[PDB]
């Protein structure tokens, strides 16, 4: 019944009091955490409250977009020495740092995706060489399906790989993906190995990285620039844009209080010291 | 005319999609269909339709006949397999290559049952019972009788009728398990095990072969469409 | 499109023990499966997987070497102990993403530089 956009609970009218009720006294031994309005510990006036906690609503915080990869890519000169350089990404979220983090506050979850792609692009050498507007290509390959190994191999043809064909200078391409986990919800962390260590074996073909799974697994995307080559090399960019939206989430955790280091949940040293100098009789 | 603005997603092509779109045969005159017998709908019907598994691909025996011939004899009784298995439909080369095989590399997850049945191709006069079996993974792959005999299995007694069914039922961590060869979502170990031994009279031939056939039960489901692997064109 | 590099190769006697280090452009391990194929010419010795676990080496040098993964560096590995004469080869470091394929040396994409490793008798 309770919605977001609703008032908080009103400030009731306390006087005087003398009686054989202790609302400040509690003892956390007990885990549960003491419910105390302020009406309680000092007198407080009759206020009819306006503030809503509208904003601060599952969905509402995780309603923005966040940067989760860079991939570059390029169009060379047909006599370079090089290969046209096509870009692949593992994708996840944790590359980066900010979108991690926020994401980390809960243990598990359920949300659509929708992505954005913001690219952009460059000349590199000192020539005045002429590149017409160029087109791009993002294809999503699904685990355990073609990834491509040239720029112009038939993998590209994609007969059933949902790609997207971006002609730069236009409004940003976007694709909405609904819950594609495995599971019922999205483990962030995972207590684990996606093998166990056997007996009758060998400790190589028993050994597995704790932390990892195929949850965290979906696919890579393969980028390119569908444009043949063209005597001036131009550079490029691919920034992917994620954005949670309906989204539910499950148990909460500490957030991540020192810097990071790697997909899991290990920390480097030298980066241990989260805080700093204060005294304890100094306001 | 009408205030509009432009959202992010203007003037990409996505290759999923789906918008109306001009025509280029106005009024064109669509030619009536008829009825066609045998017409499909899903393709898990396709993959419902037993599927003869070419099990044995030893260096000598692939890409021939011999690939689906699982030869047994009259020898004594031993607890040996007479074949091995890994329940990883969609990357098992024994397996990657049947209907049901070839119908979920084209997507990312499959779950429900599956159905071997296997089908006893030796003469009238020969008997025998079989213990073929299905063991969850995470443990020792079985290489005795007594290992996969604490699994699901169905014992199999050969005679008038030729053929039996065991049914793998899903039993697995996740909701839908990866079409590859992964561990976290790994399907586990068939086995086929002698449960007396083949047994002849004089005059018969000592050796004969059985057939494979792999297929999926009512709720077999797929998802997350993708392309397969088993197929390139260079150049 | 990553780029592979082989660092930490050298010389050392026989019996002892080395590091080899194999970092790499990117957007690594993205192009995912990393290996180590050595041989003067070409003949593998560790294949791993991005993910997971997930280890194997090959039967001829099973059980005195071992391929790590570093993704947060984004280097990989090769600690090679025991070390005998046989094992004077050209070092290399390689990946293709198709989950597969450990068996082939033609079978890749991506080959780094290499690192000649002496094992002096």
């Known amino acids: 019944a309770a919605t977001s956009r609703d008032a908080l609970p009103n400030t009731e009218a306390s006087g005087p009091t003398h009686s054989k009720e202790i609302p400040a006294l509690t003892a956390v031994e007990t885990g549960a955490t003491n419910p105390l309005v302020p009406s309680d510990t000092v007198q407080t006036r009759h206020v009819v409250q306006h503030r809503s906690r509208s904003e601060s609503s599952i969905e509402s915080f995780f309603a923005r977009g966040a940067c989760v990869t860079i991939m570059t890519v390029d169009n060379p000169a047909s006599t370079t020495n090089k290969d046209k350089l096509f870009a692949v990404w593992k994708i996840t979220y944790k590359d980066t740092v900010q979108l991690r983090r926020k994401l980390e506050f809960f243990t598990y979850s359920r949300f659509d995706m929708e992505l954005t792609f913001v690219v952009t692009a460059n000349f590199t050498e000192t020539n005045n060489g002429h590149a017409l507007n160029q087109v791009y290509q993002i294809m999503y390959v699904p685990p355990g399906a073609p990834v491509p190994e040239k720029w112009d191999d038939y993998t590209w043809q994609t007969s059933s790989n949902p790609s997207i064909f971006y002609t730069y200078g236009t409004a940003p391409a976007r694709i909405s993906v609904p819950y594609v986990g495995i599971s019922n919800a999205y483990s962030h962390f995972y207590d684990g190995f996606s093998k166990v260590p056997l007996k009758d074996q060998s400790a190589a073909l028993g050994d597995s990285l704790y932390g990892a799974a195929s949850l965290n697994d979906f696919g890579i995307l393969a980028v390119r620039v569908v444009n043949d080559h063209n005597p001036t090399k131009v550079t490029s960019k691919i920034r992917v844009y994620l954005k949670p939206k309906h989204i539910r989430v499950w148990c909460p955790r500490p957030p991540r209080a020192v810097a990071y280091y790697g997909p899991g949940v290990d920390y480097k040293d030298g980066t241990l010291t989260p805080l700093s100098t204060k005294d304890l009789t100094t306001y | 005319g009408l205030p509009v603005m432009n959202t992010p997603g203007s003037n990409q092509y996505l290759t999923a999609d789906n918008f109306q779109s001009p025509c280029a045969l106005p009024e064109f005159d669509v030619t009536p269909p008829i009825d066609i017998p045998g017409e499909v709908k899903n393709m898990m019907e396709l993959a419902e339709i037993d599927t003869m598994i070419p099990f044995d691909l030893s260096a000598t025996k692939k890409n021939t006949m011999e690939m689906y011939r699982v030869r047994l004899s009259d020898k004594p009784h031993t607890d040996d397999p007479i074949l091995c298995l890994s329940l990883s439909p969609a990357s098992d080369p024994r397996l990657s290559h049947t209907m049901l095989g070839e119908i979920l590399n084209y997507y990312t997850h499959w779950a429900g049952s599956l159905k071997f049945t296997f089908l006893f191709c030796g003469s009238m006069m020969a008997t025998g019972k079989l213990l073929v079996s299905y063991a969850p993974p995470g443990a020792d792959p079985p290489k005795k009788r007594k290992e996969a005999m604490l699994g699901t299995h169905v014992i199999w007694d050969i005679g008038l009728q030729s053929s039996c069914t065991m049914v793998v039922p899903w039993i697995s961590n996740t909701t839908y398990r990866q079409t590859i060869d992964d561990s976290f979502t790994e399907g586990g170990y068939i086995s086929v095990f002698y449960q007396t031994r083949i047994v002849v009279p004089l005059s018969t031939p000592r050796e004969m072969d059985i057939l494979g056939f792999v297929s999926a039960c009512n709720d077999f489901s797929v998802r997350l469409l993708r392309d397969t692997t088993h197929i390139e064109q260079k150049a | 499109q990553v780029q592979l590099q082989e660092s930490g190769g050298g010389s050392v006697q026989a019996g002892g023990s080395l590091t080899l280090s194999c970092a790499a452009s990117?957007?690594?391990?993205?192009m995912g499966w990393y290996r180590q194929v050595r041989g003067k010419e070409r003949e593998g010795v560790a294949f791993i997987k991005t993910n997971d676990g997930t280890t194997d080496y090959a039967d001829s040098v099973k059980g005195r070497f071992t391929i790590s993964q570093n993704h947060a560096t984004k280097t990989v590995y090769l600690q090679m102990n025991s070390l005998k004469p046989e094992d004077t080869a050209a070092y290399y470091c390689?990946?293709?993403?198709?989950?597969?394929?450990?068996?082939?040396?033609?079978?890749?994409?991506?080959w780094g530089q290499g690192t000649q490793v002496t094992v002096s008798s």
């Open positions: 390689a990946a293709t993403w198709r989950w597969s394929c450990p068996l082939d040396p033609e079978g890749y994409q991506y």
């Open positions: 990117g957007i690594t391990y993205c």
